Design an enzyme around this catalytic site. Sequence first.
Site, PDB file in Angstrom:
ATOM      1  N   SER A 175     -24.539  66.514  81.067  1.00  0.00           N
ATOM      2  CA  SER A 175     -25.643  67.291  80.519  1.00  0.00           C
ATOM      3  C   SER A 175     -25.191  68.036  79.271  1.00  0.00           C
ATOM      4  O   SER A 175     -24.253  68.838  79.320  1.00  0.00           O
ATOM      5  CB  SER A 175     -26.170  68.268  81.569  1.00  0.00           C
ATOM      6  OG  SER A 175     -25.111  69.002  82.160  1.00  0.00           O
ATOM      7  N   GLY A 176     -25.855  67.763  78.151  1.00  0.00           N
ATOM      8  CA  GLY A 176     -25.490  68.393  76.895  1.00  0.00           C
ATOM      9  C   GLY A 176     -24.126  67.998  76.379  1.00  0.00           C
ATOM     10  O   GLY A 176     -23.474  68.794  75.696  1.00  0.00           O
ATOM     11  N   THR A 180     -27.308  62.824  74.474  1.00  0.00           N
ATOM     12  CA  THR A 180     -28.670  63.122  74.050  1.00  0.00           C
ATOM     13  C   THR A 180     -28.867  62.917  72.556  1.00  0.00           C
ATOM     14  O   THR A 180     -30.008  62.782  72.100  1.00  0.00           O
ATOM     15  CB  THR A 180     -29.025  64.562  74.427  1.00  0.00           C
ATOM     16  OG1 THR A 180     -30.301  64.904  73.872  1.00  0.00           O
ATOM     17  CG2 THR A 180     -27.968  65.524  73.908  1.00  0.00           C
ATOM     18  N   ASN A 217     -22.961  72.417  86.573  1.00  0.00           N
ATOM     19  CA  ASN A 217     -23.520  72.614  85.240  1.00  0.00           C
ATOM     20  C   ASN A 217     -24.819  73.407  85.268  1.00  0.00           C
ATOM     21  O   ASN A 217     -25.189  73.974  86.302  1.00  0.00           O
ATOM     22  CB  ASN A 217     -23.745  71.269  84.556  1.00  0.00           C
ATOM     23  CG  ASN A 217     -24.857  70.475  85.193  1.00  0.00           C
ATOM     24  OD1 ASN A 217     -25.218  70.696  86.349  1.00  0.00           O
ATOM     25  ND2 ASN A 217     -25.406  69.534  84.441  1.00  0.00           N
ATOM     26  N   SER A 220     -28.593  70.092  84.564  1.00  0.00           N
ATOM     27  CA  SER A 220     -28.472  68.774  85.169  1.00  0.00           C
ATOM     28  C   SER A 220     -29.814  68.057  85.196  1.00  0.00           C
ATOM     29  O   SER A 220     -30.823  68.611  85.641  1.00  0.00           O
ATOM     30  CB  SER A 220     -27.921  68.911  86.585  1.00  0.00           C
ATOM     31  OG  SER A 220     -28.528  70.008  87.242  1.00  0.00           O
ATOM     32  N   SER A 221     -29.819  66.818  84.713  1.00  0.00           N
ATOM     33  CA  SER A 221     -31.005  65.965  84.727  1.00  0.00           C
ATOM     34  C   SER A 221     -30.932  65.108  85.982  1.00  0.00           C
ATOM     35  O   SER A 221     -30.241  64.087  86.011  1.00  0.00           O
ATOM     36  CB  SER A 221     -31.078  65.115  83.466  1.00  0.00           C
ATOM     37  OG  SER A 221     -29.971  64.236  83.389  1.00  0.00           O
ATOM     38  N   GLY A 443     -23.696  60.651  86.570  1.00  0.00           N
ATOM     39  CA  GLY A 443     -22.451  59.945  86.768  1.00  0.00           C
ATOM     40  C   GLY A 443     -21.932  60.072  88.186  1.00  0.00           C
ATOM     41  O   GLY A 443     -22.603  60.561  89.096  1.00  0.00           O
ATOM     42  N   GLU A 445     -20.574  61.980  90.152  1.00  0.00           N
ATOM     43  CA  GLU A 445     -20.328  63.415  90.231  1.00  0.00           C
ATOM     44  C   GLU A 445     -19.871  63.764  91.639  1.00  0.00           C
ATOM     45  O   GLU A 445     -20.677  63.825  92.568  1.00  0.00           O
ATOM     46  CB  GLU A 445     -21.586  64.187  89.852  1.00  0.00           C
ATOM     47  CG  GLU A 445     -22.258  63.684  88.583  1.00  0.00           C
ATOM     48  CD  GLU A 445     -21.802  64.425  87.341  1.00  0.00           C
ATOM     49  OE1 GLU A 445     -22.350  64.156  86.252  1.00  0.00           O
ATOM     50  OE2 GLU A 445     -20.896  65.276  87.455  1.00  0.00           O
TER      51      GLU A 445
END
Length: 736
Positions: A175-176, A180, A217, A220-221, A443, A445
């Site tokens: 994320s970030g 992106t 994080n 998170s998407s 991923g 994770e």
Amino acid sequence: MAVFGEAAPYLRKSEKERIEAQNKPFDAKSSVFVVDAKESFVKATVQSREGGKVTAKTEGGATVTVKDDQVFPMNPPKYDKIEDMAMMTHLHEPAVLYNLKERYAAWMIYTYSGLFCVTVNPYKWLPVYNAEVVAAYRGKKRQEAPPHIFSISDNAYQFMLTDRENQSILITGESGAGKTVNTKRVIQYFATIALEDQIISANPLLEAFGNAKTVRNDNSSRFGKFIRIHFGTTGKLASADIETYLLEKSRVTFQLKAERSYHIFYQIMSNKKPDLIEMLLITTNPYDYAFVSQGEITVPSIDDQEELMATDSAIDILGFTSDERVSIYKLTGAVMHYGNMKFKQKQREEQAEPDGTEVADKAAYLQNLNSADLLKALCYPRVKVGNEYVTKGQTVQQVYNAVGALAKAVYEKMFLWMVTRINQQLDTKQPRQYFIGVLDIAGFEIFDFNSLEQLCINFTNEKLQQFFNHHMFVLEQEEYKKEGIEWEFIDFGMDLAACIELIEKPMGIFSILEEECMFPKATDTSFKNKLYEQHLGKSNNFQKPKPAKGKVEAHFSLVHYAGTVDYNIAGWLDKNKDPLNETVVGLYQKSSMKTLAYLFSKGAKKKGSSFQTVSALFRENLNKLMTNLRSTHPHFVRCIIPNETKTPGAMEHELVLHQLRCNGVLEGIRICRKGFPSRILYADFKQRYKVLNASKKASEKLLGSIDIDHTQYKFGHTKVFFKAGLLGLLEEMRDD
């Protein structure tokens, strides 16, 4: 050299550096690596081979005794900075580790790894993507120009132009982490070489609906993302499409302590516009609503106020009416309200019944349907039996599970249909054909305390890893049919199958979990014992957790391509059961807003409204992906984060080691390194092997004379195929 333009020095170095690095003394008796206390692997300097003992000198001059199995021979400097690392005479953790550490130091960001396009990020403006490399990378094939994301994008483009075949770009960034940006980079590259503005415009509302912070994080998407950019029959942008996949469900009513529910809830809780707070009848304190108040409410990174109007404008610019938006808000408010609906057992039975219709009244008015009728149809459903109806009974717990599934379903339906509307506003009416696939995903994770969702994500990544393992298998291996020799005759995906079957087959973990969410009086302990008696000892990937490290509890240890991991089982049962009521779905169908636009209205293989479970819907849409994706040619991109902070060039190992496993690129390099990674012509072979014996028969002479066996290699008829660890033996001897 300067055959493309000016971007070379920060992209790739010229000859002078190549040769100044090629001819450098490289011993192979103290060039070994070492395992580290502070890091994983640094370049060591030993005295000699003292059995399992050395005095391995680091840059700070270390001296400790280290065994052999963790001090690693370094790749030669004639092999330094190579793009495709799948040819090095040393293929290990430190091999790739420093092969990219020194390249990020020399700022050669865009590298290759078999099929993997490993791409580190910068933290400063580097002009590698300028308007000249777009033509420099245009028309190229894969392996003649220096690596870059534009290279692989144009590769996929010309590929679909060759055989009208769909292609896909598989990207994986935190994320970030910068991915992106790489996505918009490749889509605008295609827009020129044929829109990105609409893409980025619709983007933020997505993360508003379906993102949250975690124990790891902040944004998170959770869902999956997939973009279909279709072309004409000759290649011409004629679509701008989007797919959401495997959207997480259980967030809406449950989250662990170190995180929260999705953004939109706390966004409305943020009082930048009390118009909603009054209209949705909600208060401001999120601790008043149990669905969202089981973790951390306020985040010390961003406030949710500004995001309200940010995503509001994101809505407005897209094909949304105003009533549409007030409906979205009312539905989210009702989702929030359901949490406070209370039920109490009747004194003379186990039948549930309502105590206070207050929150019932609120939620029911929020959908314009009777409240008494709603609570009745919750605590007195009825199912179609034969050719009439009977009214089933309900216990309290059953009713709670029902309303939980209700909120979850309505929220996910809202999500899917707003995505429908977005992709409805963004299409261009040109007759299109074979598309491209841009797909990000969470991923591999793994955490310190795993759970259901973590296992589901890891399983998705297992499926993806096996997918591309088999794809690389067919491509790489079945290339060499023409090479007069074959090796590694087994398929490559057939080693992840052991870990997959343990999760998806009958009597697998998911099946057993379904069993227990269906059994009459199942409990967590019964689940654990069933898992053990069905799998422990009777398999290899499955094994016992190891109590240590002062961590709370693990319950069973699975091994993956990305290492082993042990999960915690508490709560998996009630988190997975979601009996969708039916009479209330009828109520929804007969509402007065576009809530019913979601719930608009064979019997074999379809379970009942009381056998529904989350893992089933997962395993269903997961296969939907893993088949439509299997119907499309893949490509792979890896946005790494080489450093905690934004100090460019520097790269600590342990962190990039982790991303090395999440993307599991070491798995690709290890499946490609257990054979002949070194395919080479005579160009360097003759010139660097004639020094011992001063075409085809010349190769036979220049090989047999330099004391090598005819076992661990093969020159079929065009190139010679070599293991990694054998050229190092030659490296120091082909120089004398």
